[PDB]
């Protein structure tokens with residue numbers, strides 16, 4: 001059986017190549033997770049098809065209907081065999097799907113337009129001139145929704161009722177909104193993505209403050225899938241061989257424009 | 259059944275309390291992993307006994323006899339039910355025991371006495387005046403032994419044949435050897451431990467350079483143990499609630515003397 005890989009368009013993990021219109025199948029895409037999929041496939045000995053998640057989302061469970069969306073839902077409902085993506089390992093996801101040991105570490109962070117008078121999450125929470133938000137249907141939004149920490153709770157109370165809406169549908173929309181809002185929008189996103197964009201044209205954004213948490217992305221499979229074991233071993237081996245570090249360098253530091 | 263916890267004496271993870279001679283059972287010990295054991299036990303609903311690993315080691319497999327020593331061996335040979343320790347998740351360990359998702363991130367790093375003319379691993383490898391080494395029977399030594407990276411391979415060729423021996427039996431011996439050798443010994447140890455000691459009296463050591471790798475410590479159980487699932491969920495929950503971050507702060511930043 002050809003392994004159906006679910007993944008998500010997200011720089012520098014999975015990106016349409018320049019001439020994608022003329023390209024076929026897996027060849028349409030490039031990035032860290034494109035390279036990683038190839039290495040995992042080589043180590044586990046499977047053939048695979050990269051497919052972009054149908055709804056464009058990471059994964060969240062609707063509070064009323066209890067249905068999972070995003071790449072999580074594709075795995076839960078048997079629409080994909082494996083997810084190879086910047087997908088955050090979280091408790092509520094761990095309950096419904098299997099995860100590899102992490103292939104990359106990150107924490108939630110703040111992106112500002114250069115020159116925005118904000119140095120921390122505490123600064124954000126203590127003012128209203130600079131709007132701030134996050135991604136729909138992902139781990140960063142859930143973090144704020146669930147936080148009992150005073151500063152993060154204050155931020156969520158603001159965010160969930162802010163008008164016009166402070167939430168975005170894709171990280172790319174979040175980044176454009178920081179860029180275009182002249183310092184009146186700050187975006188809460190994972191350090192990995194924040195640090196990537198800080199090194200890309202037009203070099204107009206920066207990460208401020210430390211990370212708000214510490215977590216990891218894992219390769220995900222349906223609960224109890226036979227692929228799980230081999231893939232976990234593959235990630236550990238690829239880490240230990242220095243390949244994950246070589247890929248990080250390829251897609252972040254070598255992609256630097258600033 | 260009372261859960262037999264194997265762990266290792268290592269600051270600030272597990273340490274004899276000041277008045278330990280007069281103290282009984284679990285009360286003899288304090289530290290990050292002492293606190294963490296208590297939280298995991300509370301979430302999983304078990305009673306437990308902390309025991310210090312009989313041989314004082316993390317875990318390695320003898321190349322001739324193929325026997326596992328350290329906390330890894332206690333789990334493999336059925337002498338402990340769970341290991342709660344700064345135990346590095348590695349491929350060869352993953353093959354023989356179960357690991358939680360990580361509870362802490364780290365990478366191998368260099369400790370120097372203040373003022374030692376060394377800024378990196380490349381600096382170390384390109385000279386012989388300053389001896390350097392690492393811990394027996396742990397992941398840092400294995401990293402060098404297995405490295406195909408030129409700089410790390412050069413370091414290992416030096417280390418494995420250096421006289422007098424550059425290896426130490428405990429990290430505490432490694433740290434004392436840096437302190438006493440007047441800048442002629444540098445110690446290769448995990449960033450977590452290096453950063454702890456940098457903030458302790460007599461404030462005479464420092465971490466130089468970036469980390470050489472990126473990995474994680476996991477709670478370990480015998481392969482297929484029924485405890486595994488609950489403990490993994492507990493670690494993810496404790497991370498998400500901010501408790502792991504609160505413990506890090508308790509045992510590192512609040513323990514600061516420098």
Ligand SMILES: N[C@@H](CCC(=O)O)C(=O)O
Nearest residue numbers: 058086087088138139140
């Ligand atoms: N990695 C996140 C998506 C990005 C975000 O939430 O900021 C997730 O898996 O949900």
Ligand SMILES: N[C@@H](CCC(=O)O)C(=O)O
Nearest residue numbers: 316344345346396397398
């Ligand atoms: N955490 C390491 C021990 C310390 C070291 O090797 O530097 C291990 O699990 O083997």
